[PDB]
């Protein structure tokens, strides 16, 4: 039974993406309630904005011809008066659509550059040729659940049970923690000999349903996945996103996930820790206020996130809310074409 | 429980629209059967073709430069040898997509013109600078239901119960009647101190479900609304309408609504009073006849309305009928691109 809505309890910075980085949410929650001894502990979890990957915020310079990264550096200085990339913490290999197949393994020792998929154009990091991924942690507290000695999971500060089943050991700046298969990374060494975490990141198969978790539950899980896949396939074939189609990519269960929005015809994503919404009065107290993180969330040009927009009369239009009220707005059906994020 | 089909009992004139004037039908019927005293009465209701709005049938003239509405008047005379607009009866303010945000409040006293959204082009009424909305009524009869003294609703000539709950007082040419929230206007003064009707017309929230009308019923109501919204969003993103997608905008319950068709790659709408269809033999007696209003409805180029078309063999192809018979026609899936109705 999904809640009527899920709202980001914590929302990270917005980073532009293309329609091909969109993904269907993981609407699956694991209970793992076979243990009943609770002990408190403190831990560092990945800061919001770093759970998925760590950004580089680089730039692409066009010469044509092959430029030398000195004039482009000067040109970049004159231009402002970008193009992010993701590292793999297991091996420090840059990831980006411009990189051919991604995997720019050599950034510091092998070479000081790696060209894009297009031969002529090159990409250069804004920061020096090194990866800083150390100040990306926030301190939290939780209630461990460990049965006899092997930890099942823990209940974090938000009251959400996060299981360690299937968790993969991953080390970030000397802190060997565990990457939970819900996405989050937690600084726990309680795992004795769990498998080291493969470099396939979160794109790999999440399993968690081959254990036959109440096939009746998986029925609606697959139904929601099919609805999201219909929306996503429509988005990729039409190359345009509406707010009602963007509302289908929202995570239907509390936990870590992605939040999406359109800012000036640019597709954005952000790390989000969703929380269950029981009533619509929880998140819309006053006329034009969307309550996110204990405050009126600031809209830009009238759009908040996950298909929520400000109406012509100033009302917060949540596509899930409007459908339940049998109200229709052409603003939620207007499809905006998303320009390709990386032409080169 | 919706009928297998609904057919227009009375159909108004066809007026061209763009895909942005399409709307999902109101498939909600109110019973309001708390009163049992029936008394007959006579009334004037809005003639079909005027329930939604009253048309002006204007024209847009292109000079460029700012023309004077004398050469354009002569040019219009030479051209035939249009562009309608809607008034608000509460304030007589013209409505049209070309008007910036609509609301051409000044048409007679304030000014003799109001320019389009594009600065250079202007729009001029075909009729003199005044609004005639008096000969727009038809005489009917009904059975009132008034409990003790406050009217619940009435049963009109078509045997349909039309409730006065939520009705808003509205005056048309000196006849103070009531605008029922199903759309129709009825010349009744039985309402004592019901609220004067806001200028938000039928675009405003219809409510009628916040009263919690059997949430099981609202389940399928919302399901049908979601199907219609899927069809409408597909129509607006693809900018093209097929007959099978146009068949999703049909009102699923008897009452007043909109009928849609494509005439020469032009999207049309008309006022329609739908009636329940119990069998397919009701509306298709002979091979190539669609029975609308007690006669063979005249198709133009083989298309009738609401996705109904004439087949290659001469059979009337109703998309709802064909799906129930497990028959597939490429004619009902052909998407025709709708040119933008008001470029300027």
């Amino acid at each position, epitope marked *: 039974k999904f809640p009527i809505y899920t709202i980001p309890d914590k929302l990270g910075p917005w980073s532009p993406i293309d329609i091909h980085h969109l993904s269907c949410p993981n609407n699956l929650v694991v209970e793992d309630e076979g243990c009943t001894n609770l002990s408190g502990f403190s831990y560092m979890e990945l800061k919001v904005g770093y759970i998925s990957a760590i950004k580089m915020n680089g730039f692409t310079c066009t010469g044509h011809f092959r430029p030398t990264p000195d004039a482009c550096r000067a040109a970049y200085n004159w231009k402002m008066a970008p193009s992010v990339a993701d590292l793999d913490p297991y091996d420090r290999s840059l990831h980006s659509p411009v990189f051919p197949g991604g995997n720019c393994s050599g950034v510091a020792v092998s070479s000081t550059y790696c060209s894009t998929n297009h031969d002529y154009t090159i990409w250069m990091p804004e920061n020096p040729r090194l990866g800083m991924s150390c100040d990306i942690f926030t301190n939290s507290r939780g209630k461990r659940a460990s049965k006899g000695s092997e930890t099942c999971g823990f209940v974090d*500060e938000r*009251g959400l049970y996060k299981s360690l089943k299937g968790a993969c050991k991953l080390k970030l700046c000397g802190v060997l923690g565990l990457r939970l298969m819900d996405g989050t990374w937690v600084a726990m060494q309680t795992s004795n000999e769990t498998k080291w975490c493969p470099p396939g990141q979160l794109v790999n198969l999440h399993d968690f349903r081959s254990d036959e978790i109440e096939p009746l539950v998986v029925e609606e899980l697959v139904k929601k996945r099919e609805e999201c896949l219909d929306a996503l396939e429509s988005i990729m074939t039409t190359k345009s996103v509406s707010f009602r189609r963007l509302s289908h990519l929202r995570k239907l269960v509390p936990g870590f996930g992605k939040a999406y929005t359109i800012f000036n015809k640019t597709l954005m994503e952000a790390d989000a820790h969703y929380k269950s919404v029981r*009533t619509w*009065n*929880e998140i*819309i*107290p*006053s006329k034009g206020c969307l309550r996110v993180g*204990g405050r009126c969330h600031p809209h830009v040009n009238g759009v908040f996130f996950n298909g929520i927009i400000l109406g012509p009369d100033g009302n917060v239009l949540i596509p899930e809310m409007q459908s339940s*009220l049998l109200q229709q707005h052409m603003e939620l059906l207007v499809s905006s074409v998303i320009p390709l994020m990386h032409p080169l | 429980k919706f009928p297998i089909y609904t057919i227009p009992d009375k159909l108004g004139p066809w007026s061209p629209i763009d895909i942005h004037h399409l709307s999902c039908p109101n498939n909600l019927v109110v019973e309001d059967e708390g009163c049992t005293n029936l008394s007959g009465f006579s009334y004037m209701e809005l003639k079909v073709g005027y329930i939604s709005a009253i048309k002006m049938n204007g024209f847009t003239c292109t000079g460029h430069f700012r023309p004077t509405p004398d050469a354009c008047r002569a040019a219009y005379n030479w051209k035939m040898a249009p562009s309608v607009a809607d008034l608000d009866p509460y304030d007589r303010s013209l409505h049209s997509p070309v008007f910036p945000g609509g609301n051409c409040s000044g048409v007679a006293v304030s000014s003799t013109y109001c320019s389009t959204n594009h600065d250079y082009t202007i729009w001029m009424p075909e009729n003199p600078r005044l609004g005639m909305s008096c000969d727009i009524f038809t005489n009917s009869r009904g059975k009132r239901a008034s409990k003790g003294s406050e009217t619940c609703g009435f049963v009109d000539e078509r045997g349909l119960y039309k409730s006065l709950k939520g009705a808003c007082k509205l005056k048309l040419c000196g006849v103070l009647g009531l605008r029922l929230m199903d759309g129709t206007w009825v010349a009744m003064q039985t309402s004592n101190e019901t609220k004067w009707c806001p200028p938000g017309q039928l675009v405003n929230l219809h409510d009628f479900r916040s009263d919690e009308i059997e949430p099981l019923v609202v389940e399928e109501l919302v399901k049908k609304r979601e199907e219609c919204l899927d069809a409408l969003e597909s129509i607006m993103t693809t900018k093209s309408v097929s007959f099978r997608r146009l068949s999703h905008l049909r009102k699923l319950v008897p009452g007043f609504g909109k009928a849609y068709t494509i005439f020469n790659k032009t999207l049309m709408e008309a006022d329609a009073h739908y009636k329940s269809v119990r069998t397919w033999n009701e509306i298709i007696p002979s091979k190539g006849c669609l029975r609308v209003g007690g006669r063979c409805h005249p198709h133009v180029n083989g298309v009738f309305f609401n996705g109904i078309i004439l087949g290659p063999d001469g059979n009337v192809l109703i998309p709802e009928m064909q799906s129930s018979l497990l028959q597939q026609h490429m004619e009902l899936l052909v998407s025709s691109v709708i040119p933008l109705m008001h470029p300027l």
Partner: antibody
Amino acid sequence: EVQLVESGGGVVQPGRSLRLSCAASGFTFSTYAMHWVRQAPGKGLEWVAVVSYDGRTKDYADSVKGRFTISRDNSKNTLYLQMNSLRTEDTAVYFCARERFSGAYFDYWGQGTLVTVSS
Amino acid sequence: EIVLTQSPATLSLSPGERATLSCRASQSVSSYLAWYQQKPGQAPRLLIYDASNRATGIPARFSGSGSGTDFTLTISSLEPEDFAVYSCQQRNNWPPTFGGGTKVEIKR
């Protein structure tokens, strides 16, 4: 200054119906979610019902759900609580509270009208 | 519905003394707690919201502290008008819930 005045509270027999009315002034009543909060004698405050700024969304306490019905009239700037099937423990001082524009809190309350449910 | 526990129920002190009121939640309510002061026959008054912020027109002697499960309201100097019933309210979850209330009384 924001003023909330609630009236309509009186002695009612169990199982009967009472309707409370709260009049609002000093603020835009149509842009705020208004709650009803009751305080039983010798007991703490207890949230009863909420109506949204437009009246489309309404929620009630578990002990209240199915019996009371909150409503509002933005034109009248008045908030209504329709108590039905009143029971013995429904007696309390009922406050009409205004929710913060962003917050989860009741920044302004009313004086509170006492409702007594006893034969 | 989660239970806000307020201890002690009765807190007797003297004017010019610090008063420490504690609210404990059944589960963590993050920073979304509010403090209301109510006097007999008078509308309840919002003192502290978000567990730290002070409402408009509230004297500076009222302060809020805590997060998660344990919270605290402190009056720096109990004035004669501060001897009322103080109630803690949270909304981290629906429905809004109040504490049992703590009464501040003058000791003699």
